[PDB]
Ligand binder design. Structure first.
Ligand SMILES: C[C@H]1O[C@H](O[C@H]2[C@H](O)[C@@H](O)[C@@H](O)[C@H](O)[C@@H]2O)[C@@H](N)C[C@@H]1NC(=N)C(=O)O
Ligand SMILES: [K+]
Ligand SMILES: [K+]
Ligand SMILES: [K+]
Ligand SMILES: [K+]
Ligand SMILES: [K+]
Ligand SMILES: [K+]
Ligand SMILES: [K+]
Ligand SMILES: [K+]
Ligand SMILES: [K+]
Ligand SMILES: [Mg+2]
Ligand SMILES: [Mg+2]
Ligand SMILES: [Mg+2]
Ligand SMILES: [Mg+2]
Ligand SMILES: [Mg+2]
Ligand SMILES: [Mg+2]
Ligand SMILES: [Mg+2]
Ligand SMILES: [Mg+2]
Ligand SMILES: [Mg+2]
Ligand SMILES: [Mg+2]
Ligand SMILES: [Mg+2]
Ligand SMILES: [Mg+2]
Ligand SMILES: [Mg+2]
Ligand SMILES: [Mg+2]
Ligand SMILES: [Mg+2]
Ligand SMILES: [Mg+2]
Ligand SMILES: [Mg+2]
Ligand SMILES: [Mg+2]
Ligand SMILES: [Mg+2]
Ligand SMILES: [Mg+2]
Ligand SMILES: [Mg+2]
Ligand SMILES: [Mg+2]
Ligand SMILES: [Mg+2]
Ligand SMILES: [Mg+2]
Lengths: 155, 129, 205, 78, 121, 70
RNA sequence: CUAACUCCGUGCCAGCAGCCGCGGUAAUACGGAGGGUGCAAGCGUUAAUCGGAAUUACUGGGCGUAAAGCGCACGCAGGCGGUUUGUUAAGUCAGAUGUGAAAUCCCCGGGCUCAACCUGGGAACUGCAUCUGAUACUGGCAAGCUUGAGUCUCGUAGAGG
RNA sequence: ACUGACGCUCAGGUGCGAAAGCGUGGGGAGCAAACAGGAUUAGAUACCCUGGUAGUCCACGCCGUAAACGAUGUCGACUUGGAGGUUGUGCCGGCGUGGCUUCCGGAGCUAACGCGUUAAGUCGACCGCCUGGGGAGUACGGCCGCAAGGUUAAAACUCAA
RNA sequence: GGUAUG
C-alpha cells in the first residue's frame, strides 16, 4: 500500500480555561492498482492524528475499475461544495491534477488523467468528490452485464 | 403547460427507476415509441407495449441489475427551448462509447453508433449512460 | 551560458553522482556526497512536491549541462513530438553532440566533450561541427579530426569509457576514433533513477 | 433562378412593395435557432400584390435608391 | 439565465479598473515633487514612511512612496514614478524610482542594488 | 545604520483620536505626534498637559514620535 | 505561498511588503555579512493582455436564510406548443461543385555547421454559396382527433367585492 | 353533453395595491404623532402620568410604498409514507373517491439550517433578478407626483474583507 | 421603581 498525507490542520475548541488545540490529518492510501481509501483522524498531536487517519484509510478502501492506468470514461464527482471533473488521458500525459486529487489518483494507480476541481477546493471535500467519482466509474464489462449485451456489442 | 413530451418520458424513466418501479406508463406517441425501441434494443429497458386506441398508453418495463437501476443517467439534450443538431462527424460519444445518444436522422431514430455507420447526422434527442 | 562553478556542489545538492568528474577517483574520495553544499548542508529538510519536481528537473539539466531556456525548448519539442513527452525529452538530450561524444568516450566528462566539439575537433559525417547542441541523427558517423587524434586527453577518455558500461545504440572504433549513432536510445537503455514524469508535471504547472 | 420567397408587408408605393424574408438561423453563441427578417423594397410593375401575399423575388439591376429586387410571381394571395 | 434571456441581453464583462490610473498604461511617468513629507501607516504598523506628492507630465497629481533608507528629494525635484501600492499607506499607489532623474540611489546598499539605483561597488 | 533623530522636549496641547497628539515643542513649533510602540504596549497613558520627549525627523518637522512621558 | 539559513547590527525605530504579514532585545521577514537557491549576457522592477477566475458560467453558475423572485394580476409583441394522417422541404442531414489570396499555425520534408531563420508539398482555413438527394425531428400548409383549455346542466361551502 | 389545441409564459403596457401622507369638503365618541404640563434622571428633547391637535372615520381625487414575507415567480408532468383539519361526493357507523389546508417524516436535495407530492426532489416552458463590502437604492438625467416623494440608476474613492 | 463606570 502507498500512503499519502494530504493535509494537516490545527483546530481548537474553547473551554472555561482558554482554548484546547488539537490536530486533524487527512490521508489517502491505495494499492496502485485501483484500490483507494481515505481516512481522517484527529488527535492532540500530529503523528497520532496521522496514524489514526492511516488506520481509517486502510479499512475504508473502494475498488476502482481502471483501464491500463487511466479512467474508463469522463467522470464528475461532487461532495458538499466540491465538484471534480476527471477524464482519461494518453500514456505519458501524467497526472494533470491539483493537490488533493493528485494524491487520490497517484495511490489508486491512475498514471494518466486530466482533472479539474471546481467550486470549493477544501481537501476534505475534494477527496470525497474524487473517490465518489472513481467509485461510480463503469467498466465496459459491467456496462455489458447491466445492458444484457456482450462487451463487443457495447464497444 | 406540457411543452416537452419526450423530456416527460425521460423523467418518468429516471423517476420510475429511482422509485424502483417495475413499469412506468405514459401517453403514447409515434416518437416516444420510436425512442422506446432504441432503449429496448440497447437493453436499457426490458420491454414496452402500446395498449389502447383512442388514447394509447405506452408502458415501459424497467430493468434492474444487482438491485441497482440500469439507466444510471438519462438527460434530454435537444429541447424546445434549444434544439441541437450534429453532423455525422460531430455526433456525441456518451460515456466514451459506453452509453448511447439517441439520434433522430432522416432514416429514423437510432443510436449514435448506428447513425455513424449510416453516415447520418441529426437531432440529438438524449443521452442514456 | 555555461555553468563554470564547482562541479561536486551540484552532485551534493542532488544527492547523486551526476558524472561531472572523470571517474579516475571515486566521488566520496573528493567530496562529502551525502551532505548538501553549504553551512546548513547536514540538516536534511523535507522537500515539497514542487521541490521534488524541481530537483528532478535540475538533476537532468546538470547531468547534460543544459541551461533552462534551451532545456525548456527541449521540453516543448518533446511534447510536440508524437509519443511519450518524458521519453522524447531524454531522447533529445541523448541526441546532443556533446553527449554523444561523451557516451562514445572521446571526452572524460560531458564538459571535456563540450570543449572538444567547441574547439573544432569533432566531425559528423566528415564535416566539422562545433555546436554542442547539434542533434545527431541515426546512422551519423562522429569522428575525431586528424589534427586532434594526437591529443592525450582523448586517449585517456577512451580508457575511462571501457570502465563504464558501453551504450548499445552507439558503436565506437576506439582505434579509428570514430563512432556511429546507430539509433535513438530507448527509455530502458537509459538510467531508471531519472523520473521524467516529474519533469513533465513540473512544466505542466 | 436565384430567388427568395417572402411576405408582402406594404403596398403603399406606386409599382413597389416591401417584402419581409424570414430566415431561421442558429445563434452564434447560444445555439438557439432564431427567426431573423430581411426587408427588401421590391419592384412590382403591375401593382398585382397586396399586403399579406407570399411572393417570389429575384435580384436585379438597381431601380431606385432602395430597390434592387423585382417580383417573379405571387405564390399565395392574402 | 435562460437562453432566450441571454439572446435578448448577453452576458456582460466586468469592466476592470486599473490600480494605477495616473500612469495611463505607461510603465513609468516623470513628475515634479510638490511636497515631500512623512506619514504614519495603518493600524498594526508603526513608522514615519517617506512619501512625496508629485505632479506628473500628464497633469495627474499623486502620492508616491520613496523606498530605501534616506533620500535627497525636495520640493521641485524631478523624479520618475512607477506602479506599486504600499499596503499600509492609504492612497499610495506609486513608488519613486531610486537612481533615475533627480532621485539618488540609496547610500551604502549592497543587496537588491538594482532596486535602489546603486552601482556595483 | 539609521540616520539620527532629533529628540526634543514638549507639552501635549490636545489629545486626538487613536493616540495622536498635538505637541508644542520647546522651539515653539506644534507637531502632530503619535505614541511610541514601547509606550503603547506598556500602557503609558499620555494626557493633555503632559511633558513629553518627541523624536523628530528632518524629513518632516510637522511630525514626531512621543518616546517618553515625564 | 515558493527552490534556498545562519551570524552580527537595529529595537514597532530604521525599514520591508504581491498577499498573509514582519520590526516593541536574543528578527531564518529590516540593513550588512557568510552560506545557499534560481536564472544567466542577462537579471530584476514597472506597465499591459489573456490565464488561473465555473469571478458574466454557450461549453460552464446562481436567487428560502450568503448578492439575487417584480407587492399582485391581466395582457399586446416575443419565446414555447398535445395527438394522427397527408403534403411541403424552410430549419436539419447527406453527397457534390465553386469559393475560402499569399504569408502565418500545424504535419512530413529540404537548406543555412546547429538553432533561430529560410523553404517544397500537404493539411487546415471549423465559413459562404450553389446543385442533387433524405424526410425522423422542428417549421409551413391541409384535414382530422380528444387526453390540454374551455362552454352548458345540477348542486355545495365561503369575513370575496 | 358540447367546442376542438381555442394552450402556457410574458419585456414594454394596463390595472389592483396595508399604513402613513396629500387635496377639497364633511364628521369627530374613543385613541393619539406634534404639543402642553407633571415626573424620573448626571441630563431625559424619551420610556411613566395628566391632557391634547393633526390623524384615525366618510365622500371624491391623489400617492404607489411596507419584514407588500412562505424573505420561496407562473404553468405542466413525475416521485415511498404517517397523523390531522376543512369542503364535496359515491357505495354499504364502515368502505371509497375529488378540492383546499396544518403537522411530521422517507428517498433525494441542501453549506448547513432545513425542504420533502402544497419540494428547496426529478424534469420541461417562459419571465424577473444577482455578480465582494461600504459609497448607495445615493448622484446626475428621464418619466410620474399638488407635495411628501416614488421609479429607473451610476461613478470616483476607500476597505480586505 | 433605571444593574451610569471593573
Ligand atoms: C435602564 C437603562 O438601560 C439601558 O442602559 C443600561 C445601563 O444603565 C447599564 O445597566 C449598562 O450600561 C447596560 O449595558 C445598559 O444597557 C438603556 N436603555 C438606558 C436605561 N436607562 C434609562 N432610560 C434611564 O436611566 O432613564
Ligand atoms: K508528446
Ligand atoms: K507591525
Ligand atoms: K449556464
Ligand atoms: K415535416
Ligand atoms: K403575448
Ligand atoms: K382630536
Ligand atoms: K450537521
Ligand atoms: K469597490
Ligand atoms: K431623479
Ligand atoms: Mg542565450
Ligand atoms: Mg443607388
Ligand atoms: Mg522552502
Ligand atoms: Mg538580533
Ligand atoms: Mg472566463
Ligand atoms: Mg456563485
Ligand atoms: Mg440579511
Ligand atoms: Mg439576502
Ligand atoms: Mg412573491
Ligand atoms: Mg408539435
Ligand atoms: Mg432544405
Ligand atoms: Mg491561406
Ligand atoms: Mg409536420
Ligand atoms: Mg389611510
Ligand atoms: Mg384628509
Ligand atoms: Mg389620551
Ligand atoms: Mg400619552
Ligand atoms: Mg420594495
Ligand atoms: Mg405572513
Ligand atoms: Mg422580496
Ligand atoms: Mg399570466
Ligand atoms: Mg418535513
Ligand atoms: Mg437551495
Ligand atoms: Mg432616489
Amino acid at each position: 500500500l502507498q500512503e499519502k498525507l494530504i493535509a494537516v490542520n490545527r483546530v481548537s475548541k474553547t473551554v472555561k480555561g482558554g482554548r484546547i488545540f488539537s490536530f486533524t490529518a487527512l490521508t489517502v492510501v491505495g494499492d496502485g492498482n485501483g484500490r483507494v481509501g481515505f481516512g481522517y483522524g484527529k488527535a492532540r498531536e500530529v503523528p497520532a492524528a496521522i496514524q489514526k487517519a492511516m488506520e481509517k484509510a486502510r479499512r475504508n478502501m473502494i475498488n476502482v475499475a481502471l483501464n491500463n492506468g487511466t479512467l474508463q470514461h469522463p467522470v464528475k464527482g461532487v461532495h458538499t461544495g466540491s465538484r471534480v471533473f476527471m477524464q482519461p488521458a494518453s500514456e505519458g500525459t501524467g497526472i494533470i491534477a491539483g493537490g488533493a486529487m493528485r494524491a487520490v489518483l497517484e495511490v489508486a494507480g491512475v498514471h494518466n488523467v486530466l482533472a479539474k476541481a471546481y467550486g470549493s477546493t477544501n481537501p476534505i471535500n475534494v477527496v470525497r468528490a474524487t473517490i465518489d467519482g472513481l467509485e461510480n466509474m463503469n467498466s465496459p464489462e459491467m456496462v455489458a452485464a447491466k445492458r444484457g449485451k456482450s462487451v463487443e456489442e457495447i464497444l | 403547460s406540457m411543452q416537452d413530451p419526450i423530456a416527460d418520458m425521460l423523467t418518468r424513466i429516471r423517476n420510475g427507476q429511482a422509485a424502483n418501479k417495475a413499469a412506468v406508463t405514459m401517453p403514447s406517441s409515434k416518437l416516444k415509441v420510436a425512442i422506446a425501441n432504441v432503449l429496448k434494443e440497447e437493453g436499457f429497458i426490458e420491454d414496452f407495449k402500446v395498449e389502447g386506441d383512442t388514447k394509447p398508453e405506452l408502458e415501459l418495463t424497467l430493468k434492474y441489475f444487482q438491485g441497482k437501476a440500469v439507466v444510471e443517467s438519462i438527460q434530454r439534450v435537444s429541447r424546445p427551448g434549444l434544439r441541437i443538431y450534429k453532423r455525422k462527424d460531430e455526433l456525441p460519444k456518451v460515456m466514451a462509447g459506453l452509453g448511447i445518444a439517441v439520434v433522430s436522422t432522416s432514416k429514423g431514430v437510432m443510436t449514435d453508433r448506428a447513425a455513424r455507420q449510416a453516415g447520418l447526422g441529426g437531432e440529438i434527442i438524449c443521452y442514456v449512460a | 551560458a555555461r555553468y563554470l562553478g564547482p562541479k561536486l556542489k551540484l552532485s551534493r545538492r542532488e544527492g547523486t553522482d551526476l558524472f561531472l568528474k572523470s571517474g579516475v577517483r571515486a566521488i566520496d574520495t573528493k567530496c562529502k556526497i551525502e551532505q548538501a553544499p553549504g553551512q546548513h548542508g547536514a540538516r536534511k529538510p523535507r522537500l515539497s512536491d514542487y521541490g521534488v519536481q524541481l530537483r528532478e528537473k535540475q538533476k537532468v539539466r546538470r547531468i547534460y549541462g543544459v541551461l533552462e531556456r534551451q532545456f525548456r525548448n527541449y521540453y516543448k519539442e518533446a511534447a510536440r513530438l508524437k509519443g511519450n513527452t518524458g521519453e522524447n525529452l531524454l531522447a533529445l538530450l541523448e541526441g546532443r553532440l556533446d553527449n554523444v561524444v561523451y557516451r562514445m568516450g572521446f571526452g572524460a566528462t560531458r564538459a571535456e566533450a563540450r570543449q572538444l566539439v567547441s574547439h573544432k575537433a569533432i566531425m559528423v559525417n566528415g564535416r566539422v561541427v562545433n555546436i554542442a547542441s547539434y542533434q545527431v541523427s541515426p546512422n551519423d558517423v562522429v569522428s575525431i579530426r586528424e589534427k586532434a587524434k594526437k591529443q592525450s586527453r582523448v586517449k585517456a577518455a577512451l580508457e575511462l569509457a571501457e570502465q563504464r558500461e558501453k551504450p548499445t545504440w552507439l558503436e565506437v572504433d576506439a582505434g579509428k576514433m570514430e563512432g556511429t549513432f546507430k539509433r535513438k536510445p530507448e527509455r530502458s537503455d537509459l538510467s531508471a533513477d531519472i523520473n521524467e514524469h516529474l519533469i513533465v508535471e513540473l512544466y505542466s504547472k | 433562378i436565384r430567388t427568395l420567397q417572402g411576405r408582402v408587408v406594404s403596398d403603399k408605393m406606386e409599382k413597389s412593395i416591401v417584402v419581409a424574408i424570414e430566415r431561421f438561423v442558429k445563434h452564434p453563441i447560444y445555439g438557439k435557432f432564431i427567426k431573423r427578417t430581411t426587408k427588401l423594397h421590391v419592384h412590382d410593375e403591375n401593382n398585382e400584390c397586396g399586403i399579406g401575399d407570399v411572393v417570389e423575388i429575384r435580384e436585379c439591376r438597381p431601380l431606385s435608391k432602395t430597390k434592387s429586387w423585382t417580383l417573379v410571381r405571387v405564390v399565395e394571395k392574402a | 439565465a435562460t437562453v432566450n434571456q441571454l439572446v435578448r441581453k448577453p452576458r456582460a464583462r466586468k469592466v476592470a479598473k486599473s490600480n494605477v490610473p495616473a500612469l495611463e498604461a505607461c510603465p513609468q511617468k516623470r513628475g515634479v515633487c510638490t511636497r515631500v513629507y512623512t506619514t504614519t501607516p495603518k493600524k498594526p504598523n508603526s513608522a514615519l514612511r517617506k512619501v512625496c506628492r508629485v505632479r506628473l507630465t500628464n497633469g495627474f497629481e499623486v502620492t508616491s512612496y520613496i523606498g530605501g533608507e534616506g533620500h535627497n528629494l525636495q520640493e521641485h525635484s524631478v523624479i520618475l514614478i512607477r506602479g506599486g501600492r504600499v499596503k499600509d499607506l492609504p492612497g499610495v499607489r506609486y513608488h519613486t524610482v531610486r537612481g533615475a532623474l533627480d532621485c539618488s540611489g540609496v547610500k551604502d546598499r549592497k543587496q537588491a542594488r538594482s532596486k535602489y539605483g546603486v552601482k556595483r561597488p | 545604520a539609521k540616520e539620527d533623530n532629533i529628540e526634543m522636549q514638549g507639552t501635549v496641547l490636545e489629545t486626538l483620536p487613536n493616540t495622536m497628539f498635538r505637541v508644542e515643542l520647546e522651539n515653539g513649533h506644534v507637531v502632530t505626534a503619535h505614541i511610541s510602540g514601547k509606550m503603547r504596549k506598556n500602557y503609558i497613558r499620555i494626557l493633555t498637559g503632559d511633558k513629553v520627549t518627541v523624536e523628530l525627523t528632518p524629513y518632516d518637522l510637522s511630525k514626531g514620535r512621543i518616546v517618553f512621558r515625564s
